[PDB]
Symmetry: C2
Subunit: 234 residues, 2 copies
């Protein structure tokens, strides 16, 4: 088993910011239960970087398969056991999270040359399943450049088997990821884990165009959220 | 479930002092694995009071039955789920712990009148099963008075079913506890949970004679250990 700390008491937390503000300053996996969530679920809490970040997505080493269909992107998948592993929290969980409070999205990015950048968006919100988990994002700031925005109309989430109202997957690309794609496909943090510069039939890697363009696949991603108005306790 | 923190990595710790010195300052239940222990086991770590205390016994509310035989006192029993619950760590585990390093025993005591005291003994050591888990204790200091010492020859542990080389229990007292009894029976922190002053056939309560005498049963006990030469990290 992992090192685990059993506090010997129970309290329900909506997100990692509430955990941090209750005095828990250790990064690790915790259970959270957003207001409208039918059950608690594991999430990585990044308590660095000012504290209280709920990690919604992580890439690190290429271990996990992100070529998943609508169901897996809805429910969540990946590694909720290892500190440095990879996961997708699940669109249903994103919706339950981002409707209970107004969150900032921060995206921590690293390349294969030990460089890092970040992108931050105020008011990140994910719509419900009937609305294809559509993305709303507010004001950008940071160093990575704004690759997420549909201006690069809310962007629907798509998967290989749920793409422009086709449910069968017959026009899907190889290794097609789940994302809120814009016209330029300028971001796809759920793309194929290549080792930096790459070539393939399509530009389907871990792309953040405004930093390294379409044909460079990033080394590390953490997508994480915290309330816009988060105030760290002490 | 309780609030639990999964660090997402593994490291083996011999005791709660090693956990604390590795940067974990939260009181709670952790797994430890003493050098000679065949397996890891849960223990409460009291990280207050200078840090790194491994709790070996706790009394709080009278929930658990301490009228247990040799086997249960050897293996450990009680509540390893609730912060304020009661347990006995187990004599085999005490032996594995106290032979790997030289520990100080601290005993935190409270009465029903919101008073507290403590007793501390340098070089607490518990012998092996063949030697009836015999107690060795060194220099006393504190406010509660020295009720543990056999001077009040190493004291053998006894239970109802292992008492003066009788294995059947035919001369056992009602509610007889497991302890290292001295002649005066001046301590029995494993005794019956009465509410302070009490009367019964025998003085079989949670007794620490040097503080409140034989016929007063204490409210709270924590018996905990840390290496004599423990140096807190930062």
């Amino acid at each position: 088993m992992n090192t685990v700390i059993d506090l010997g008491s129970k309290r329900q937390y909506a997100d990692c910011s509430e955990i941090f503000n209750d005095g828990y300053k250790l990064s690790g996996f915790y259970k959270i239960k957003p207001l409208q969530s039918p059950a608690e679920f594991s999430v990585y809490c990044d308590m660095s970087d000012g504290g209280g970040w709920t990690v919604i997505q992580r890439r690190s080493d290429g271990s996990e398969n992100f070529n998943r269909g609508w169901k897996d992107y809805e429910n969540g998948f990946g590694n909720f056991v290892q500190k440095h592993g990879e996961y997708w929290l699940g669109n249903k969980n994103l919706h339950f999270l981002t409707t209970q409070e107004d969150y900032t999205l921060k995206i921590d990015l690293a390349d294969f040359e030990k460089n890092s950048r970040y992108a931050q968006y105020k008011n990140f919100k994910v719509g419900d399943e009937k609305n294809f988990y559509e993305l709303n994002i507010g004001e950008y700031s940071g160093t990575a450049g704004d690759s997420l925005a549909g201006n690069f109309q809310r962007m629907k989430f798509s998967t290989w088997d749920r793409d422009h109202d086709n449910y069968e997957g017959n026009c899907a690309e190889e290794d097609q990821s789940g994302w809120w794609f814009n016209r330029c496909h300028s971001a796809n943090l759920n793309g194929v884990y290549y080792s930096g510069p790459y070539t393939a039939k399509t530009d389907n890697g871990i792309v953040w165009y405004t930093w390294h363009g379409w044909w460079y696949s990033l080394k590390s991603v953490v997508m994480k959220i915290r309330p816009n108005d988060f105030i760290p306790n002490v």
